[PDB]
């Protein structure tokens, strides 16, 4: 399915360019968000939003839907986060290497498909590739899959950052860096 989708998009772009028109990309549906500041001197409103996003510790990461209520929530905490649009390789790496489940209240590492099937009790989520597909394509069970997991706890980026206190556009780090979030996360996972 993935390979076919990519090929179809390539053909559509070629057909537009041949006659000199333009092809509009679909707006992104999924965002990946990581926290880049520690827990000190935070206002009550920002504190509440970060708690609701489950980002309670520096270098915690989550996946969210990129719709209007979520975007307006994300805009209010911009100095604290770095976010962007993930790729399939990034989603696979996060699930396979840093993925844990909420089982009985505990944080349990994923080690086989049987525990995934037992946690979810759904015929559409029985394996790690099912989880990957739901997260990547923003399918019907996006909330079920993401709510079922513990937030991702990542390491600091090897090689360093640029400037915590400035926006990415000003040569800093915080805010929306679009597809370039994948290079950032490859050094943290």
């Amino acid at each position: 399915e993935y390979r076919g989708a990519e090929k179809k998009l390539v053909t559509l772009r070629r057909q537009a360019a041949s006659h000199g028109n333009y092809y509009l990309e679909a707006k992104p549906k999924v965002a990946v968000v990581t926290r880049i500041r520690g827990i000190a001197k935070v206002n009550p409103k920002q504190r509440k939003i970060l708690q609701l996003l489950r980002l309670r510790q520096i270098f915690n990461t989550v996946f969210v839907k990129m719709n209007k209520p979520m975007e307006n929530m994300l805009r209010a905490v911009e100095p604290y986060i770095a976010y962007g649009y993930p790729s399939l390789a990034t989603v696979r790496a996060m699930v396979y290497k840093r993925g844990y489940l909420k089982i009985n209240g505990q944080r349990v590492k994923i080690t086989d498909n049987q525990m995934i099937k037992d946690k979810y009790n759904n015929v559409d989520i029985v394996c790690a590739e099912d989880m990957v597909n739901q997260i990547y394509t923003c399918g019907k069970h996006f909330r079920t899959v993401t709510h079922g997991m513990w937030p991702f706890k990542l390491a600091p980026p090897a090689g360093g950052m640029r400037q915590k206190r400035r926006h990415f556009v000003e040569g800093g780090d915080y805010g929306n860096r679009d597809t370039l979030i994948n290079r950032f996360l490859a050094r943290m996972i």
């Binding site: 559509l12 092809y23 707006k27």
Partner: protein, 152 residues
């Protein structure tokens, strides 16, 4: 500190709008209020009998009592760590019917109509599509966006 009366600091709150003075109208008189209705409490500065305190001037509540000329309303008010339910008594000139539930009532009505049509077997309307999808754009005008000498 020195002066704190019932109507202190209401110079702009209890005043009529520009070129809109006068007294309530027959539409206000002929409005029916039942127990259990949602109402807005808005003070009418030209009446002066049965006027609420300035705290309640923009709040919405539930009617709990109707008298020959008055209405009793329940309004939430936070005090220190809790929310109290205060009962205020006003004249009927100072309330309006609230439209805070129009969308919910409309949603229930549309659901009933859809159920009726689905049971009848009538054809359903075509569902709307998303505006965030892709497509090919055929342009009519293309321009050049630039900063020029004359701009400054």
């Amino acid at each position: 500190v020195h002066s704190y009366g019932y109507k202190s600091g209401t110079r702009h709150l209890f005043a009529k709008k520009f070129r809109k003075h006068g007294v309530p109208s027959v539409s206000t008189i002929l409005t029916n209020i039942k127990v259990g209705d949602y109402v807005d409490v808005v003070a009418d500065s030209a009446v002066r009998e049965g006027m609420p305190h300035k705290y309640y001037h923009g709040r919405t509540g539930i009617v709990w009592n109707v008298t020959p000329r008055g209405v009793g309303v329940i309004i939430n008010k936070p005090v220190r760590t809790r929310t109290l339910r205060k009962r205020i008594c006003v004249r009927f000139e100072h309330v309006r019917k609230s439209r805070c539930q129009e969308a919910f009532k409309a949603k229930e009505h549309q659901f009933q109509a859809y159920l009726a049509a689905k049971k009848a077997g009538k054809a359903l309307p075509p569902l709307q599509k998303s505006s965030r999808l892709g497509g090919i754009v055929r342009p009519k005008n293309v321009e050049v966006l630039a900063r020029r000498v004359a701009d400054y």
